Amino acid sequence: QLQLVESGGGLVQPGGSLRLSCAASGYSLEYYAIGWFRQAPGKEREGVSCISTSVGSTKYADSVKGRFTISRDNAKNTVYLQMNSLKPEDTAVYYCGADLSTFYGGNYYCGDRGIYDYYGQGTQVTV
Amino acid sequence: LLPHANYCAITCSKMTSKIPVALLIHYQQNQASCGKRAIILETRQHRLFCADPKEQWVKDAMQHLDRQAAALT
Amino acid sequence: DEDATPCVFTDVLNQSKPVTLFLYGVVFLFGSIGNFLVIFTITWRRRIQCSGDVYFINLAAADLLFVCTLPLWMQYLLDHNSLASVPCTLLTACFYVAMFASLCFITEIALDRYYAIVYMRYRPVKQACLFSIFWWIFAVIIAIPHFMVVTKKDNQCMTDYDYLEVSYPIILNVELMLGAFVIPLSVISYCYYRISRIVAVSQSRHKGRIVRVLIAVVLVFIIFWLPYHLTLFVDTLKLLKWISSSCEFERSLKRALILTESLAFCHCCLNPLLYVFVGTKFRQELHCLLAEPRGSQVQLVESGGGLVRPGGSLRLSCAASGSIFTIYAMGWYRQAPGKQRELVARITFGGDTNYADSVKGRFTISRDNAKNAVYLQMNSLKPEDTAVYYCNAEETIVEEADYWGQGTQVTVSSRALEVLF
Ligand SMILES: CC(C)CCC[C@@H](C)[C@H]1CC[C@H]2[C@@H]3CC=C4C[C@@H](O)CC[C@]4(C)[C@H]3CC[C@]12C
Ligand SMILES: CC(C)CCC[C@@H](C)[C@H]1CC[C@H]2[C@@H]3CC=C4C[C@@H](O)CC[C@]4(C)[C@H]3CC[C@]12C
Ligand SMILES: CCCCCCCC/C=C/CCCCCCCC(=O)OC[C@H](O)CO
Ligand SMILES: CCCCCCCC/C=C/CCCCCCCC(=O)OC[C@H](O)CO
Ligand SMILES: CCCCCCCC/C=C\CCCCCCCC(=O)OC[C@H](O)CO
Ligand SMILES: [Zn+2]
Numbered sequence: 373q374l375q376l377v378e379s380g381g382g383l384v385q386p387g388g389s390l391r392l393s394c395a396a397s398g399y400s401l402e403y404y405a406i407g408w409f410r411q412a413p414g415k416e417r418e419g420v421s422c423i424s425t426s427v428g429s430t431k432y433a434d435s436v437k438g439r440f441t442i443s444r445d446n447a448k449n450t451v452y453l454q455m456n457s458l459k460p461e462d463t464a465v466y467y468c469g470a471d472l473s474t475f476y477g478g479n480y481y482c483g484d485r486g487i488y489d490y491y492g493q494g495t496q497v498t499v
Numbered sequence: 500l501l502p503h504a505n506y507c508a509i510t511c512s513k514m515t516s517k518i519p520v521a522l523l524i525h526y527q528q529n530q531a532s533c534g535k536r537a538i539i540l541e542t543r544q545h546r547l548f549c550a551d552p553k554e555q556w557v558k559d560a561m562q563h564l565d566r567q568a569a570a571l572t
Numbered sequence: 573d574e575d576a577t578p579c580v581f582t583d584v585l586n587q588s589k590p591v592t593l594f595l596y597g598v599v600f601l602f603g604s605i606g607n608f609l610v611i612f613t614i615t616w617r618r619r620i621q622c623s624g625d626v627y628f629i630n631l632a633a634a635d636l637l638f639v640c641t642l643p644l645w646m647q648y649l650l651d652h653n654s655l656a657s658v659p660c661t662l663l664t665a666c667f668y669v670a671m672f673a674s675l676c677f678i679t680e681i682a683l684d685r686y687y688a689i690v691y692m693r694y695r696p697v698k699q700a701c702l703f704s705i706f707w708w709i710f711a712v713i714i715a716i717p718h719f720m721v722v723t724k725k726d727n728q729c730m731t732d733y734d735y736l737e738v739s740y741p742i743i744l745n746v747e748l749m750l751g752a753f754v755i756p757l758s759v760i761s762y763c764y765y766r767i768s769r770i771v772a773v774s775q776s777r778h779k780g781r782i783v784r785v786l787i788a789v790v791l792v793f794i795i796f797w798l799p800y801h802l803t804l805f806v807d808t809l810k811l812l813k814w815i816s817s818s819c820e821f822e823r824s825l826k827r828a829l830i831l832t833e834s835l836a837f838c839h840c841c842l843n844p845l846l847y848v849f850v851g852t853k854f855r856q857e858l859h860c861l862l863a864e865p866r867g868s869q870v871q872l873v874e875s876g877g878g879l880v881r882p883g884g885s886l887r888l889s890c891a892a893s894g895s896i897f898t899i900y901a902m903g904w905y906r907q908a909p910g911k912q913r914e915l916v917a918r919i920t921f922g923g924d925t926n927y928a929d930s931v932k933g934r935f936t937i938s939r940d941n942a943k944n945a946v947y948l949q950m951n952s953l954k955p956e957d958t959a960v961y962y963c964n965a966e967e968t969i970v971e972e973a974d975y976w977g978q979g980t981q982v983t984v985s986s987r988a989l990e991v992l993f
Contacts, residue, residue, distance in 0.1 A: 409990035419993075472981055488989065510822060511579075
């Protein structure tokens, strides 16, 4: 089947810059809308970014709009979320999921409250 | 084969009133024909005519011709 | 002494015989091939889906029985001795049984498509087979007085006129003219006129071609049968003594009967092109077997999708937004991301349902004809059923299935949710 694997983490104080690398294992993810969501220890889930099959669609959160940067790449079937200017609020276990909501036609436009199905084990970003 | 479009060679439109018994030389039953039974009477003038078979004067003319048509008998 | 002398046809027959033999071979060549491909297309690796398919095969079977007699008749023309008195009648039997059956099913095509469009009366496959039996029985019992009288007299197989009354060939032509032409042409004309007058104002995206297809059926029927029946009319007028007829006129009328007869035999070669091979579905199917800025018209609005845990149930709903009257079947298709489109549930308006092997026993498809709605109850859902479900609709006569929905997402798994804000 399709299973996701994220391999971006580390321990950096506020101001650092990490790269969240999410690779697809089993299916080339040219066809799914993949997005990032985090969950700090003791808090509820929350999404931070989202990218789709269509070239123009993109989504970011209110508290991270501009600080992060997501981008798709067919090389090794891996999307990337470049975390720049980290804050203590970003201290959370990030997960890489595939959004299966709001498919208007042909492509999965990224959607609010999108159900995720194939997500990895998670990465720890300590800030 | 649809009707009336079959391959018949002889068709009679009207029958003769009467043929004198001394003018006919031969009668041939229709080898092939479309309409009802029709007898072809050949006169001494070598001209063909249609004749109805169910007639009193045609029946005896078929007995006179057939008897005299038998070659050397 | 002079009166009407026998009118000879020896030269007319000698000039017409090669044309008849040629056309017989042409009709036998294309008629057998064209009608085999019809049966092959609707049976080979595929079940009969609609009532139209039943009548198409039965129409091709009647044409087959007709064209398979032509090589027997060709041996008859080349030498009259070849046919005895007992095969002729039997061989003549196959001509009228197949001829009347061909006209019976042609009439049934219009009727079946008449009651479906205007009266919304749909026939399941099971019922179409039953009517085909009735028509075959009706075609035999109505042909009895047409071939049982043909015997071999004076080495020519001919209608035995001596054992019948003089009124018989007149009645036989009148019955054949109105029974085989007037009545069939009146039914298929009235039916296709009523149908064309409804489709032309509907919102179907093939209303144009539907009318053109139905007009061709009527036009081809006329341009192939009318010359024969119009020659019988002037021939019946001749027998009826209403008009005069010289010898020359009977010779022209004889040749016309022979020529127009061979013309009417070509109509059974065109039946595959008039009903079956005019629809795109049969065109695409034959290929896969022969081995080589605004919205438009009616759009299918879908609703009823969503997310549910494994073992739940969902109800997909699909309906036509516009007013279209030529849809005879609808179904559901799905496409998982990165996989091909597969059929999961198809139902016709007649009632015959068709499910996939993996799905049968879990999903239940239902429809509503008055609303042109189709519902799919998806019970006992599995994680493997996660795909985008598309709705499809098929159209009659034109045999098009280019009515698709936008596609709804159905995900069955132990998913995770993350509200983005
Ligand atoms: C669209 C249809 C009519 C196609 C036209 C076919 C033509 C060839 C048909 C239509 C009417 C037919 C004619 C009807 C009447 C007769 C009179 C007869 O003494 C000779 C044959 C003849 C003359 C037929 C010949 C064939 C004919 C002229
Ligand atoms: C599709 C087209 C080619 C069909 C045309 C029909 C043609 C082939 C047939 C139909 C009726 C036939 C005509 C009817 C009767 C006669 C009178 C005869 O003394 C000469 C031949 C002639 C004139 C025939 C010639 C060919 C004919 C006109
Ligand atoms: C002179 C003695 C008789 C002469 C006989 C000449 C040969 C007859 C052959 C006919 C071809 C038959 C073609 C096949 C017809 C069956 C088509 C079919 O598959 O059946 C339809 C189906 O059953 C519907 O539901
Ligand atoms: C061997 C002899 C060769 C002779 C070859 C003759 C072939 C032409 C067919 C004529 C009758 C069938 C006509 C079919 C009528 C359909 C018209 C139709 O559907 O219109 C097309 C549509 O508008 C756009 O696709
Ligand atoms: C001069 C002699 C001329 C002879 C001319 C013969 C014309 C034959 C026409 C019709 C008879 C067929 C009658 C068939 C009746 C079937 C009724 C039936 O099956 O009912 C279906 C029901 O209506 C579901 O809609
Ligand atoms: Zn004498």
